Structures are given as structure tokens and as C-alpha cells.
């Protein structure tokens, strides 16, 4: 679920998601466009190509069990179909917060038309 | 570019293309993700494929010529690349006209959080 990628998000980069990323750059929220703006907007590239692989669940609003035992998150469960988006989330957080550093405020609320025509391939 | 296209739906359709259809179902606009919503928003959906296959130029910000020439854009000059893209619009705006009568007013601002996950092949 969207509000469990949330809450990993807020808990790996302190910021609120909602505010922060649901709209940065060209593939971060929605669905994508172009090519990804900077490596922050990346991790949501690839996390679109992630959600793209699950087939026989939704990733967007079943909800998976997952643990932060040991400031990690930890994916768990029998299904791997739910599995799979979970470790999806869990690497998008995580490169969430490897890139932090690089995070650029103007890319936050980024307009869609400015995306480049060409997007990039998975 | 796409004030052209704005010009050519306006036309076809008699309909402000900014109000009814920039932010139509899944596809229309810039971006577009899912499952169609409907007839109208597969002509979006194709109109973003057409785009994808224009490699020499700007879809989205060059301008082409053509001529309204017997109530029927008429895709003109010697580019083209620029003339490929006329043809992506003008398919388009000939598509919004065909399928006006399963216009749902339902789906003009649709949230994409409700498109869904798994976005159809080009
Ligand atoms: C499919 C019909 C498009 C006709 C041209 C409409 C021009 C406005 O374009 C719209 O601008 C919005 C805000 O800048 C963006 O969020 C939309 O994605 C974009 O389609």
C-alpha cells in the first residue's frame, strides 16, 4: 500500500511525503514522464519500473507486511507477489535517503509539460 | 506544438481543449498512466504513443505547419519529423470528434492515484 511507502519514506528521510515527493520532478508520484530529472527523481524511475514486474497483486493499494526491526525495514509474509512491492518501497526509501543530499526544492511540484517527449526505457 | 493541437481539438470538437480535455481520464494531458478510461481517453493514450515514435524533433514544443484546408487539417512542409507529429495531433483532435457522444464529464480532472497500476503496452 501507498500509505505503508509513506510512512518508510518518513521514517528513512525525515520529511513529510506527502509534501516532499509526491510531486518531484517527472516520475515521482503518478506515473512518469521523460527523462528523471536528477537522482532523487530516479529512484522514482525505478520504482515505476519495480511496480511494472508484480503481476499477480496491486501494489498500489494492497497492503504488505514488512518490520523495522533493526532501523531496517524488513519485507516478510508468504506471499511474494505482496512481498515483491514491499521490497519495492523498501529500495525506493532507501534511495530516498542515499540521495537526500542531492534533493533540490525547485523539482518539488515539478510541471509535467516540461518533461522531456522522449521517455527513458526501464 | 501544442497550442496547435489546442487549436485543432477546439475546432473538431467545438469544446476549450484547457477546460475539457488537459486533464481528461488516465492519458490526456502530458503524462499518462494505467488503463484507458474510457474511448476518449484511449485517443490520448494513442496520441502519447504516436509522440513516443517522433525521434527527430519536439512534439510538444516545435512548431509544424499545416492548413485547415476543406474543413480538414492538411499536414504540410518539407520536415518530416514536424509533419509526423502533425499527424499525431491531427489523428487525435479527429478522435476527441468521433467519440464526443461517450464524453464523460466524470473523468475531465481525474486523479491519477485511481489510474491503475499496471499501464497498457503502446
Ligand atoms: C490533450 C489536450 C491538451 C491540449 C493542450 C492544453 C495545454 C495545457 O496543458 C496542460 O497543462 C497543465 C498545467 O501546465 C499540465 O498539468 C497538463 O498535463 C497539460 O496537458
Known sequence: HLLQFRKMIKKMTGKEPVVSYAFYGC???SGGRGKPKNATDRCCFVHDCCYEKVTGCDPKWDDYTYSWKNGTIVCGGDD?????????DKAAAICFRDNLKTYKKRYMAYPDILCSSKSEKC
Chains 1, 2 share one sequence.
Not at 80 to 88: N, R, S, Y
Open 27 to 29: 516520475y515521482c508520484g
Open 80 to 88: 511474494p507477489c505482496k512481498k515483491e512491492v514491499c521490497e519495492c
